Every structure is written in structure tokens, then in C-alpha cells.
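re: ur question from earlier - yeah i can do the single chain one, its not a big deal. heres the input i used so u can compare w yours
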Amino acid sequence: QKQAAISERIQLVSLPKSYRHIHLSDIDVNNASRMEAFSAILDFVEQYPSAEQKGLYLYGDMGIGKSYLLAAMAHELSEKKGVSTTLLHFPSFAIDVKNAISKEEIDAVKNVPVLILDDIGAVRDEVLQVILQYRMLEELPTFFTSNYSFADLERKWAWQAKRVMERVRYLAREFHLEGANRR
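and the output i got, formated as C-alpha cells:
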């Protein structure tokens, strides 16, 4: 069955191919926190597109499936709606873009309908800051995953710019996720 069309609308940047094949059914909803996060992911898909529709900032322990949950949202957005999503592993994007001595690097990322910035934290205030700034003005839904909460993420960054953190809080609502996912 040539239903690999919804899968191709999901652009990946420094992430294994499996992140393009994650369905809502693969997500465990066996916690109060996962019930809440899953609930918000379904509202987003159902209400897309909305006025100033905000993304989600998912944080919690490493390896529990925070990125998977968001990948499942991207898969459902491509299947129900026809929207493209980009899942990007920030730590790798930062380093690969840092080598700006050469392309389509950040332009293919800042204007996508829905952008997922995987495990932010752990680059500068010149690339992320501008991408976020542009998505704020353009009203483009932006999500994030991290090992740190808002307060902890900021308290880890450096003086610093500090306004990059205000853009994160403006673009996404914080959700603490607990419990690993099966697989």
C-alpha cells in the first residue's frame, strides 16, 4: 500500500529514520502526566491551524519517549491534515550549523509549518534566537523536548542573552513527562 506519503511529509534533521514512523498507538498513556501531554497533543492536531496555537515544551528524564510522543503528533498531522513537520535534533544542528564557513541549512527549518526542536539544552544566541524570533512573528507552532524545565534550562545557560528563553516560554507551554514508553 502506497501510504508512505504521510511519512515523507516529516522532515528529519540528525535523527534516525524511525522517528518518521511513529504512530499515536505506539504512545503509552499510563500516567497522569502522559494523560495530560497526550491530551494536549490531540488538541493540537484537532485544532490545527489555530490563531496563536502554541506548541509544547516537553521535559523529563532521558529516554522516556518525549521525542516519540511529538513524532507521533507529526505523523498524525501529516495523516489527518496535510501538514509537513520537521523533527530536529538541536545538539547536532547547532554543531553542524556552527560550521558556517561554506547553505539551505536554516532556511529549510525556520519556515516549516510545525517545528520540533529535540532536546534543546545539553547554536549561540544568533541562530536559535533568530529562528525563534522569526517563528514568533510568523506565528508558526514550535515544540521542544528537554531534560530541564524552563527554570532549570535558563539557570543552566551561562549574562547570556536571556531573551531567547523568553521566546521559548512564549512559543510553548511547559509539560513535565514521566515514565518510559515501551519498545
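The first helix runs from residue 5 to 8. not sure if urs matches, ping me
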